[PDB]
Design a protein around this ligand. Sequence first.
Ligand SMILES: Nc1nc2c(ncn2[C@@H]2O[C@H](COP(=O)(O)OP(=O)(O)OP(=O)(O)O)[C@@H](O)[C@H]2O)c(=O)[nH]1
Ligand SMILES: Nc1nc2c(ncn2[C@@H]2O[C@H](COP(=O)(O)OP(=O)(O)OP(=O)(O)O)[C@@H](O)[C@H]2O)c(=O)[nH]1
Ligand SMILES: Nc1nc2c(ncn2[C@@H]2O[C@H](COP(=O)(O)OP(=O)(O)O)[C@@H](O)[C@H]2O)c(=O)[nH]1
Ligand SMILES: Nc1nc2c(ncn2[C@@H]2O[C@H](COP(=O)(O)OP(=O)(O)O)[C@@H](O)[C@H]2O)c(=O)[nH]1
Ligand SMILES: [Mg+2]
Ligand SMILES: [Mg+2]
Lengths: 427, 427, 90, 430, 429
Amino acid sequence: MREIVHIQGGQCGNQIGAKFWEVVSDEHGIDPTGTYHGDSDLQLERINVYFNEATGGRYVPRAILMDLEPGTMDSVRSGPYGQIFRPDNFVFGQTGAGNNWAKGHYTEGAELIDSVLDVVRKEAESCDCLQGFQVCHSLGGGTGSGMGTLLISKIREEYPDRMMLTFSVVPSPKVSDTVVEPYNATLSVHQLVENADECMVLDNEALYDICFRTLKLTTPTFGDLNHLISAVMSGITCCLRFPGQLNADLRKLAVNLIPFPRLHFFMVGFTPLTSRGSQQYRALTVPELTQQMWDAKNMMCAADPRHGRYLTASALFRGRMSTKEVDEQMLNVQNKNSSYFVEWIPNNVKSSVCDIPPKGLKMSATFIGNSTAIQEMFKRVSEQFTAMFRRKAFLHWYTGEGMDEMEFTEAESNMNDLVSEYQQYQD
Amino acid sequence: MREIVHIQGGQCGNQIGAKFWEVVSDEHGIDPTGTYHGDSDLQLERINVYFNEATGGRYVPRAILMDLEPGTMDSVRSGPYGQIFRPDNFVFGQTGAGNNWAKGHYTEGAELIDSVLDVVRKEAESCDCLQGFQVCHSLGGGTGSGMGTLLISKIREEYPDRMMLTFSVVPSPKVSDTVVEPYNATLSVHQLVENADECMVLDNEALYDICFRTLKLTTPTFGDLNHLISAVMSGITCCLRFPGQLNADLRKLAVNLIPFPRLHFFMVGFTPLTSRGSQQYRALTVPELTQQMWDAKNMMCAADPRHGRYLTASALFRGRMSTKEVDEQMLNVQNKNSSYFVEWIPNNVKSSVCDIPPKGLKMSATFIGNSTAIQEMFKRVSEQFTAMFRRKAFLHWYTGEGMDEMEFTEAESNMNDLVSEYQQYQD
Amino acid sequence: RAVAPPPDPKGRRDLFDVLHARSPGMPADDSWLGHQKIDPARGKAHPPGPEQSRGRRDLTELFTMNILHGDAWCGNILIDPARGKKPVED
Amino acid sequence: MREVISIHIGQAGIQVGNACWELYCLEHGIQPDGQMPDAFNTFFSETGAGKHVPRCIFLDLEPTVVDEVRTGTYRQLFHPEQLISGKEDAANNFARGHYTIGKEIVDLALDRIRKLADNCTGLQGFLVFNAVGGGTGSGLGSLLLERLSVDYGKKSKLGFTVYPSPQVSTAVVEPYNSVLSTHSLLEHTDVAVMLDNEAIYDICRRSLDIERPTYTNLNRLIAQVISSLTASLRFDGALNVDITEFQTNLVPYPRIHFMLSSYAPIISAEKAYHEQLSVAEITNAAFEPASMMVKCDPRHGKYMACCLMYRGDVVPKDVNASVATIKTKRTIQFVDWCPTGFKCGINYQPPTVVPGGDLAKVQRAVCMISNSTAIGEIFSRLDHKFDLMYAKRAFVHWYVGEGMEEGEFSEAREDLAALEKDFEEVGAES
Amino acid sequence: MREVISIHIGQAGIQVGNACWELYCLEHGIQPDGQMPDAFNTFFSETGAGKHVPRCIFLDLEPTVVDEVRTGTYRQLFHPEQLISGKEDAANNFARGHYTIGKEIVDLALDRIRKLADNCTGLQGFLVFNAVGGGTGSGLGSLLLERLSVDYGKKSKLGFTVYPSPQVSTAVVEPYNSVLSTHSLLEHTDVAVMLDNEAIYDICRRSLDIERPTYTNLNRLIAQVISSLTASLRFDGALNVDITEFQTNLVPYPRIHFMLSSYAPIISAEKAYHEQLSVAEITNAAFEPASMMVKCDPRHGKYMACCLMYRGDVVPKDVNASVATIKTKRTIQFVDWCPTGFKCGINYQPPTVVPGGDLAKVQRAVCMISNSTAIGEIFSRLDHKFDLMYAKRAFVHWYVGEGMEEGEFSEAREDLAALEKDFEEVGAE
Ligand SMILES: Nc1nc2c(ncn2[C@@H]2O[C@H](COP(=O)(O)OP(=O)(O)OP(=O)(O)O)[C@@H](O)[C@H]2O)c(=O)[nH]1
Ligand SMILES: Nc1nc2c(ncn2[C@@H]2O[C@H](COP(=O)(O)OP(=O)(O)OP(=O)(O)O)[C@@H](O)[C@H]2O)c(=O)[nH]1
Ligand SMILES: Nc1nc2c(ncn2[C@@H]2O[C@H](COP(=O)(O)OP(=O)(O)O)[C@@H](O)[C@H]2O)c(=O)[nH]1
Ligand SMILES: Nc1nc2c(ncn2[C@@H]2O[C@H](COP(=O)(O)OP(=O)(O)O)[C@@H](O)[C@H]2O)c(=O)[nH]1
Ligand SMILES: [Mg+2]
Ligand SMILES: [Mg+2]
């Protein structure tokens, strides 16, 4: 009865949650029509966390789909598992953000955010107890970045005692899908530090390397990329939807992983990723699950774990597992390379066990890492921002909606403050 | 709990290695699928020394495949027992050394050693207690010789207390398969005299002689070469994989065979070989192995043991054999040929009995010989290297990528230092 | 109007069979089995070869010693058995 | 709902539009009579029962090209009052197109966009087609963008415009009309795309392999460029881009909005079988100067921002790999203050081949729109020839007789003069 | 993947090429339209669905040879823009194809080379095919070899060059063109396989027993030789020898890279039935003094290094018996500083047979490439003829007018003279 209200924002946010509700319903056994077809009583024991019971056995998710372009709601509706959402929850506008953070936050945000909070407060007041809100967006765009951070700042004022689990697709170092990626990111991270309680940093270039090195996928589409992040999002809340030996819900990981309020960005990895060829060869045991857990390439963030020390890391083990290899392997990763861990925290790493595995897989685990090596990800975007800001490139569009030049300086000032704080504890 | 990590390098190593697990797996009763199908319970008792457990009852070889061409991995995988290896251990490059030793050691080897050290480090930590590493390669080539010898240097710095078992074939006296084989062998031998713990010297025309005289075969193919090596390679590890009355492991052979740290090049032969027509007429007993064991026509090295005295000897007898017949035949060859044995080591021969023979054979044995007659092989390569180096022929293909003539004089010096100390122990 | 997405070359739509353990596969049908830019299923074509062409000869039958439950030469290295004078009856 | 209004001024505008509306019927199955046997809302409005009328206007002072639409195969498709005609042509006089014989038609014009504005729900932009070489395309084009700015504010009027080539020109008075029309084009058009005839002549000769191309063969591949960038609004894709997406991502400065154009697989019928068209190969061929729509060398300048619109079976990884290959290459040089120089747009529907056309059926195509610093070399070319004729005061008595005074030419010269310093200032390192 | 770009320069280059691609399409089963009814990946590229285009360009300044390919049965096999034509030929002038005319085509050809270099995943080498008797093969060949060294540095390139014969010639100024083109071959070609037409004429006369051999009979066996050495890239064998292996085993010194060539089984249909093809005798026929494709006497010279490419059902032991028998033979000679002379290469696939060709089906084949001091006598005759015409300025005014001054002849004379001194010092004991 620890409910989570899910919000999807923007083109990327709608697509990542489209595969998210496809996976979590397949774990719980709901068909695309809406009925229940699972073979276990434990699947239906905790369905209140992500679904609302309706008349006739229908289950509706606690999902609010929001954007500004009606093309993506055509994409999620025409796609599979797209009929399960509430038609009243399809709140959005018609103007389109156009990858402008200022338009997504200031001009059309005034008319949009009034209607969306009515849908969100309807979902929150319906359930008896709230655990938090799970939002998903990107930081390179404007439809989910500016609009999402406007929503997150507004929803934390209304509900300050509930956690905010956000999923962000940050811009790539190697490539760039949008030209104004440093402008969108540095303003969005300036809003995420004080509103979001913790953030899980995602990016395509780490997912692309995983889809080619470990998974060995020939044609990784965005549907392929969406399943990797969505497999995490089921695994984070595994102790909520299922009973476990050592339960760890969304507030358990919050106090464990976060030393200071400004330091709440994580690098995330899903452990049992195998190719189709190497399914029979790899033996699913905990010690080989731990080495894939702590592999730098298996991290779904482009920041390299070898460059910086880990402050606190957590593991969400799933399956019928005994708890020495849960603990000794997390002890062994400390003594094998103690230089890569923060000295003033004894036993930086962390673990918990849920005895219900995912569908068809014996052992699984989800890794959350709060390391100081993510500073170069924020250092690079800040470096990319100051190059453009000095020449005032691509700014006459942003100042058109009503953003003065002072707010861009304040956003960059927080980036240098945040990147120095990570370097403060690295020394 | 004495595990062996196998590394196969180049055209020679992969083709030998492909036929090596042909003899290991069917002795343990493993199908090409990888499951278990044997009837004897003793086969299941010690499999972990060469295989790793996989989910579904599969047994996967503890082997690491390395090369510089994608040709041999296509050759190994296409053959029988070619799908047993992991897809992860098939690490190589696309360039190809082209028998250029410095290409495999300095330029085109640098980008791959860091990749092949990761799979060595992953495989060593998986097993609880290493017994030794087992590398099979050539000395006339440049891929298995150049990158192989850099791997010996890298694997000795990381693990300096574990045995090293190098199965290196040497350039021929009679014919030449590669034109630059004195250049590559002398540089490879200089990299083996310090780091390799024990080297088992093989030659192809010693294998050509036994298959045409003893086996009496009309058209012996290229797999005839590999099967005689594989019976030897499994013959060394007979006391590990199976019980026995007298046990002799890989370090046990090394201490009794090596009197001084640079005396670690061995000539090895295989005892129970016969032709088709001679099978019904021979009486396979303990003594008839010994007269064929010590005979130079059954030797598998280029050097003739009759020229130089035997420093130390070894005998790994397999089968339900009477120890007193292993006893009295061992002393019988010493007194019959007393000029062929070193005076200042009484009881040069070492013996061992394992009670489980190879599949289908009644009695078997393997002879490992350390003799001072092996200097004639090293003198031949050193003479052929000095003849080319004095006119600096074929040297721009070596000095063009980062080598000078200083270590060529050093490799010639360590070569002549090695053959001088063989000769003074002969006196 | 949702036009069809580009079809997969090997009929893979949602990677459920890849991420989950259902439908295990052969080591082929992957992107690479070497280091990179190598097709695993597409390698050098294999001719029948001399060992398979020249009868049944492999060394498993000679090593395993199954004869109890041919020779190239007998005596001198020159001649071969079963090739000699024509036997004459009466 | 998404919809764009296409406006075609002048004989160059109509002839591209004849090739354009030829193409738009093929992606939606519309017969020439107008009966489909619901992605057409960008260009077609469902009228009555089973009849679609294009969301366009064909306005021209010269009646000799608008009646060809009326007497042609597309008589029943277009609404008759939708097509606007005039008594007499501009005769390549900007003064006639802007002051004397232009005001009586533009009043009838603005009543026609207004009725298409009320019929449509949410407008995304206006697609305006004109050529600066003629008085109708320049004069009526300059008037029409000004009236749309004061009536429909902050709406992204995305323009395609034909410019004079250095080597080949079809009229003597082209430099006068080009400079005058550009001065109105800076302050009005949000996004303008550069088109030049002789580069497409080289494209038809080199890639498509046609010895004598015609104006019809030119506009057929031009309409492919229009359809490819607007295909994101019509059909869903992995990474969709709207009209508002282009202006906020390819315009670094409000006066630097002159983006180049390029197309990928411009490949004939027999050339398509032997060509191995891959995502990496078509991205490299996009940035070659041979595939450029404008005869200007991009190697002389720095790419400030470039946008790639992919259509067909494009996996998002291969376009992600093609971004890295171009930026690593030394020949393609970017400006120092824009590391994020690229934008990718992937659509799932391949381009539709016109039957009887010269282009072949191709799975994958890329429309390369780039904002560079090499456009100033084109505008330095037009500035030089404008000063040559203006020094002796040639072909000026035609213009000053028809309404204009002398002062408009000097102010248009100075306004265009500040553009090449602005392109030099934005290109210089700091 | 292993893959090589084979390019053909000049009239002799293209006529080798279509003779080569006649054999390549039959070897991989590719139909002439390009539709197959992974060994092809070395030479062909997979295109769309079931189309295989060669990784080959056909450049010549004279369009008379190129449009025969565009008209004949292989018109659908080649991509049209791979085939590069020119306006006027170099017309047996080195300077025309090197300075004046060839500069308008070498920019177009290297652009096409880069597109094939972009399409290929991992490049293995290049195969240039040119004749040094003509201006296009010499001049445009030298100009293109200049750009290949600076574009793709340290990358292997194979030079199959048809040198002038001592007696037979179809050209007059060919001592000028061969000397000037040789100066480019010293500095840029890593491995240059020598060829000569007269020795192939002798091979067809006495072995293939055809007394009227034309160019298509000569180029068919040349197609067998190039396919034999590259066959390890396409088919696996007992001892694979790829393109990179030839550099480090046949080139002792950086300025000695001219090698002879031999193909051992050269027999007719009726001759093949009576004869016995054995590995022991096929090596003797490979080293037979009349079996080479370059008019040299290796008894005059000394073998510095040898490479043997055995094809077919060759077991790995009679080949080593065959190598052992050659070294014991006192007629053949090997240099004193190289004891390990031979290199053995064994493949598993017999050579294909063209329908209507003179060759018959053979179970075994040997392609022999050797570096010898006997190739030094080719240049000695070439220097003797070149010094005669340059003694009193014959045929120089055609070379002076089109760019090249009189200084390049003195440099080419001196550099080839240093090549002669290079050959005699390495054979010294
Ligand atoms: N791409 C393309 N350009 C064209 C075509 N037809 C004409 N042009 C160009 O357009 C220029 C003139 O454009 P317009 O302003 O439309 O000419 P107009 O409408 O007849 O103007 P007036 O002659 O004054 O009546 C010419 O110089 C041509 O270069 C065409 O069919 N395709
Ligand atoms: N092996 C072989 N050699 C040929 C053949 N055809 C011509 N040649 C040789 O080519 C030489 C003539 O020079 P080429 O390079 O072919 O002349 P080209 O290619 O037409 O160049 P240009 O004359 O400048 O146009 C002659 O000496 C012949 O030995 C052929 O079919 N096979
Ligand atoms: N994983 C994933 N990422 C996506 C998808 N669609 C877009 N993206 C990412 O989103 C980024 C662009 O952000 P955008 O969609 O424009 O954000 P918006 O303005 O909120 O719509 C790109 O870097 C893409 O990698 C998707 O379906 N899956
Ligand atoms: N016994 C044995 N010797 C081999 C085998 N393959 C190659 N050789 C020997 O290795 C030498 C050539 O090795 P090479 O192919 O150059 O190895 P590379 O360095 O990996 O290229 C030859 O002299 C062969 O006799 C094999 O499978 N078994
Ligand atoms: Mg013991
Ligand atoms: Mg007109």
